[PDB]
Design a protein around this nucleic acid. Structure first.
Ligand SMILES: [Zn+2]
Lengths: 101, 149, 129, 217, 83, 65, 101
RNA sequence: GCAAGACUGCUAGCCGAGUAGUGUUGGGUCGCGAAAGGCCUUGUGGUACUGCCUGAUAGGGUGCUUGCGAGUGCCCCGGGAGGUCUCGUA
RNA sequence: CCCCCCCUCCCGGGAGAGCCAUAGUGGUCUGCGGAACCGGU
RNA sequence: GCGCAAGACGGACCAGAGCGAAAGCAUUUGCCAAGAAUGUUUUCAUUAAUCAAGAACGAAAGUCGGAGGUUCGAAGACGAUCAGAUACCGUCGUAGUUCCGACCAUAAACGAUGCCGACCGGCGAUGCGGCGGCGUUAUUCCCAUGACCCGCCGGGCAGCUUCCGGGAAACCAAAGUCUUUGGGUUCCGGGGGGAGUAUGGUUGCAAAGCUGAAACUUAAAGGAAUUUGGCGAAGGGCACCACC
């Protein structure tokens, strides 16, 4: 039984792409098949941001962020509840969930 | 589709239905004939001759101002070469590819393109032999690379 | 490449009739096509069909009345006899009250009934019903 | 519709068309509405030809008055914009309205209380209201549509090019259709128009009902 | 369309289509003539030159080879000829 | 369910009409494309119609991603 | 003094643009790189270290870069990302005193 | 040669003058651009404002705001009065 | 004196390359006839 | 934290994007050679399509000879897990991994769908080349130039939708134009095991690659989808025969 419209990745005219490595795993999943994440994280999220700011010598100093990205294998991503399964009638929904915060 | 390329193309000339001499042009046959004579003794191939005539002298085509094409005129004079121009260019391209592959050893796709152009040379050679413009003892090899350049 | 223009023409007019277009286009043209379309219009499955002429390749515009069901081509070019065409029309035609078999004889492109009444036969072009 | 002399458009109908905004279309373009769009103007808006609109209005009005039973034609509305128009049109002409949640058990289910099979169906828009099209497919029932240049056309006998995003345009088109069908039936004579009010079919948003209630006595 | 008439449509319909999809077969390119502003002799040139051409008298180059139609030298008067 | 009385704000509202029809505006805002549309149907020009400038700015078709 | 100046550049998305891709061809990038190398090597080989540093404390090289490269494809973000030194001349004291005044 | 019409850049009285200087995309009739000096009727009515900044009252960067988003506010000189503008506070 | 100040409101004087316009103002387009045709220098 | 030295690799930029016949291909620069598409009122004029013989290329792993081999890491060595692990896990670790040659021609080398050519609907996008048309950007006026926008043309990866139509259904704009059965052409299969097995030939230093049985047993082996299952599957709600 064929499952999807595509083959499950972003290979449609190439045949082979470069392999990448997972973060919590080490599987050599291809780049067009894996799951990426462009996460933005501050140095202090909500824990002691006022304690950091009031201890700062420089007036009007803003904390920087950490723009790092991670690569997940499919089993590693489904174990960490990153992606979730759904039904067949809504499986053709490429649109991401909405962003608010 | 093409006979070696994977893709299909559509790009060629398209003569109009109107088979007539252009009324705005005032040219006879003798002046354009000696223009063919001069541009042929200058040392150019007939495709470039048709290009330079329809570029400079404003002629639509020679077939609409005469009753024959370029190579028939050149063989009527006798200045047409014994080797056809497309076969000459294909042999020159094959000689250049083999000369490049002499010094570049590990080059697989260039060798494949050499095989393809040798197949083209073979197909045109069988066609030109069976239409009685070349003698049957003619045969293309690598050692003829300096013979028919 | 294209090596049977009549099969392509009949398949194109069959597809365009099944969709229901009124005026169709055929990119090649030949003697066999124009005599086949005249015997079409004489027996009454089409209307006023046109043709454009140029010095390269003519095209044919055919008017339709919807009085056709399916119009196929025998490929390759088979030959029949007078004691043989009944075998073809029994296993090919949908009935004997309608459906015609066209064939090329010595007198030209013509259908099987006047070939039967004139007692001659030859190679077979196609069929329509 | 265009074969005779008196059936052509009048002088104030063009003014009502240009006032109500019955000439501008959406953003895209369909492949069945190609013969009503003449030329694409700026801001990605296509223009319908108003002569075509008036002509198809005459043809649809003729098809409506062709039957001799006034209570056998049905009008359908789904969205909250055009609601009073079809109701007062059925009050004037004699039609049967269904406004708001067209139940699917009307033309097919023959045991229900709301079982009425009509002869002609008039839909406000096929895209916004497609349920009576599917049920009209299952019985001998033609449809009349007020379609826009972005509305898909399917199971439609007579198509009216319209701008169905403003309530004034839909109400004025219903007003002219009612005017034409009563002139063709023989109630209002052709030599004198009955044009007393086009705002009988105009819908206004729920601000203006309170505003006009406070303004009036 | 159902009864789409392919006998004689509007000329915009043959304009928007391809040069070979057109039911009457005719190309789109044309012949033209153009001069030099400081000269008397005027010569003709095709719309797609594909070689660099200079006007007669060996004074100033005229056209430039492009992928499409040949662009002309700045400050030159021309008109399309037809027959 | 229907209500017998809720102080006059019922289906009697679909009876009245404003005294101004809101259609006889003295100035008609018409683009020149619509002017060349209507110059060949039944009219050629109107005194109550003002020909406006074609509001052609930059573009249209705003994106959503 | 021998240096190794690095540069980086990102293209500018127009406010009128609707297409989200906004890439550039390889020859455009090649000619931009050639112009960037020529402009960057022109401003250093003519002057000493102090003058090119005083030109490098504001954005003057970068201002020249988005002055000269917007004619081929509009780009907005160019910083001199890293300057690496390789070799120094013979050690002396007058230069060290004259950089301090 | 006749008939008058629609559009058109600069100057603030004119010559000086589109003149030095001024630009990298490439040229063009090529933008912006004073003068010194000299000469004449002796030099425009109604109509808005101006966050430094590269190129103007334009294009292209880019703020302060109740901490959060926003309506108002932000050229040189002078006179009086006041010293906590507002809409909801994840 | 709430002030070294600074800010806001009310009222005036100066440059501008906005609109309707003035004096010196440069070109494009809108019709009519070159008595009427065929070649050489 | 500062220098030296070796080897490997070119992230983020990188996308349902490009190129190539496929296997595959990402630091800049310099040289050589080839090619699709676009445009053409240029040239030869049937040179055409598919292909038994035969031929080229071909991921990793494998074998033969070398300098040199960072990191990772078959077989193996040492501890914990475990009723029992010579498995999962950790630390070392040889051959290998990279380069120059010499070879076998095997993958889910799969789009599990042969090539060419004709036809049958739409929508909105991206990539190349050409084309027409408002308005902005490279000292303020023009020109084509690079970019922005609106439409058109041809080829390619495509996406959405469609009682066109097809299919056992999953699904397909081809897997369609098929009992209303014939466009041209190459390879290839008849219930399931035995068995890609033994023999024979063939190539190879080497592993194996190609070719390719018989006896006997067997009435099922298989493909699609539905109904409550049953999940150390996910997500909601309830119970003191559950908890705080
Ligand atoms: Zn993982």
């Amino acid at each position: 039984t064929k499952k999807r419209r595509n083959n499950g990745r972003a290979k449609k005219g190439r045949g082979h792409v470069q392999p990448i490595r997972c973060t919590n795993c080490a599987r050599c999943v291809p780049k067009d098949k894996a799951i990426k994440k462009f996460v933005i994280r501050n140095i202090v999220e909500a824990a002691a941001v006022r304690d950091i700011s009031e201890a700062s010598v420089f007036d009007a100093y803003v904390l920087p962020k950490l723009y790092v990205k991670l690569h997940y294998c499919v089993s590693c991503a489904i174990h960490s509840k990153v992606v979730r399964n759904r039904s067949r009638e809504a499986r053709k929904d490429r649109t991401p969930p909405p962003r608010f915060r | 589709g093409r006979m070696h390329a994977p893709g299909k193309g559509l790009s060629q000339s398209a003569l109009p239905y109107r088979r007539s001499v252009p009324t705005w042009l005032k040219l006879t046959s003798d002046d354009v004939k000696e223009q063919i004579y001069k541009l042929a003794k200058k040392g150019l191939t007939p495709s470039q001759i048709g290009v330079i005539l329809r570029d400079s002298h404003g002629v639509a085509q020679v077939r609409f101002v005469t009753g024959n094409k370029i190579l028939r005129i050149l063989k009527s004079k006798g200045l047409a070469p014994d080797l056809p121009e497309d076969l000459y260019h294909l042999i020159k391209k094959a000689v250049a590819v083999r000369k490049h592959l002499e010094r570049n050893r590990k080059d697989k796709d260039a060798k494949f393109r050499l095989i393809l152009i040798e197949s083209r040379i073979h197909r045109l050679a069988r066609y030109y032999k069976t239409k009685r413009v070349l003698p049957p003892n003619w045969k293309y090899e690598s050692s003829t690379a300096s013979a028919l350049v | 490449v294209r090596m049977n223009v009549l099969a392509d023409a009949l398949k194109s007019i069959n597809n365009a009739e099944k969709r229901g277009k009124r005026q169709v286009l055929i990119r090649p043209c030949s003697k066999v096509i124009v005599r086949f379309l005249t015997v079409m219009m004489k027996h009454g499955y089409i209307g006023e069909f046109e043709i454009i002429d140029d010095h390269r390749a003519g095209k044919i515009v055919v008017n339709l009345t919807g009085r056709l069901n399916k119009c196929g081509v025998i490929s390759p070019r088979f030959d029949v006899q007078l004691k043989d065409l009944e075998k073809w029309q029994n296993n090919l035609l949908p009935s004997r009250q309608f459906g015609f078999i066209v064939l090329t004889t010595s007198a030209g492109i013509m259908d099987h009934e006047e070939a039967r009444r004139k007692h001659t036969g030859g190679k077979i072009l196609g069929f329509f019903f | 519709s265009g074969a005779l002399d008196v059936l052509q458009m009048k002088e104030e109908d063009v003014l009502k068309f240009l006032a109500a905004g019955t000439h501008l279309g959406g953003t895209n373009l369909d492949f069945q509405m190609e013969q009503y769009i003449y030329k694409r103007k700026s801001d990605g808006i296509y223009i319908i030809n108003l002569k075509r609109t008036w002509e198809k209005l005459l043809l649809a009005a003729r098809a409506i008055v062709a039957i001799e039973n006034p209570a056998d034609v049905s009008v359908i509305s789904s969205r909250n914009t055009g609601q009073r128009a079809v109701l007062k049109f059925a009050a004037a002409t004699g039609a049967t309205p269904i406004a708001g949640r067209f139940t699917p058990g009307t033309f097919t289910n023959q045991i229900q209380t709301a079982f009425r099979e009509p002869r002609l169906l008039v839909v406000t828009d096929p895209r916004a209201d497609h349920q009576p099209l599917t049920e009209a497919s299952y019985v001998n029932l033609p449809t009349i549509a007020l379609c826009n240049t972005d509305s898909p056309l399917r199971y439609v006998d007579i198509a009216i090019p319209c701008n169905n995003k403003g309530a004034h345009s839909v109400g004025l088109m219903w007003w002219m259709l009612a005017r034409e069908v009563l002139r063709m039936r023989g109630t209002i004579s052709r030599e004198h128009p009955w044009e007393v009010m086009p705002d009988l079919y105009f819908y206004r948003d729920p601000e203006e009902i309170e505003k006009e209630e406070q303004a009036a006595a | 369309p159902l009864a789409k008439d392919l006998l004689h449509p509007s000329p915009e319909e043959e304009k928007r289509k391809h040069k070979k999809k057109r039911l009457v077969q005719s190309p789109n390119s044309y012949f033209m003539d153009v001069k030099c502003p400081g000269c008397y002799k005027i010569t003709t040139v095709f719309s797609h030159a594909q070689t660099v051409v200079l006007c007669v008298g060996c004074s100033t180059v005229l056209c430039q080879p492009t992928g499409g139609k040949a662009r002309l030298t700045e400050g030159c008067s021309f008109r399309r000829k037809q027959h | 369910i229907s209500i017998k009385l809720q102080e006059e704000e019922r289906e009697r509202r679909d009876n009245y009409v404003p005294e101004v029809s809101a259609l006889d505006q003295e100035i008609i805002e018409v683009d020149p494309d619509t002017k060349e549309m209507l110059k060949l149907l039944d009219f050629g020009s109107l005194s109550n119609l003002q020909v406006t400038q074609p509001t052609v700015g930059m573009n249209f078709k705003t994106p959503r991603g | 003094y021998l240096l190794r100046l690095f540069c980086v550049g990102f293209t500018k998305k127009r406010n009128n643009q609707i297409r989200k891709t906004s890439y550039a061809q390889h020859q455009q990038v090649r000619q931009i790189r050639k112009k960037m190398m020529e402009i960057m090597t022109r401003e250093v080989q003519t002057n000493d270290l102090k003058e090119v540093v005083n030109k490098l404390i504001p954005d003057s090289i970068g201002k020249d870069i988005e002055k000269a490269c917007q004619s081929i494809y509009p780009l907005h973000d160019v910083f001199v990302r890293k300057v690496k030194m390789l070799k120094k001349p013979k050690f002396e004291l007058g230069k060290l005193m004259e950089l301090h005044g």
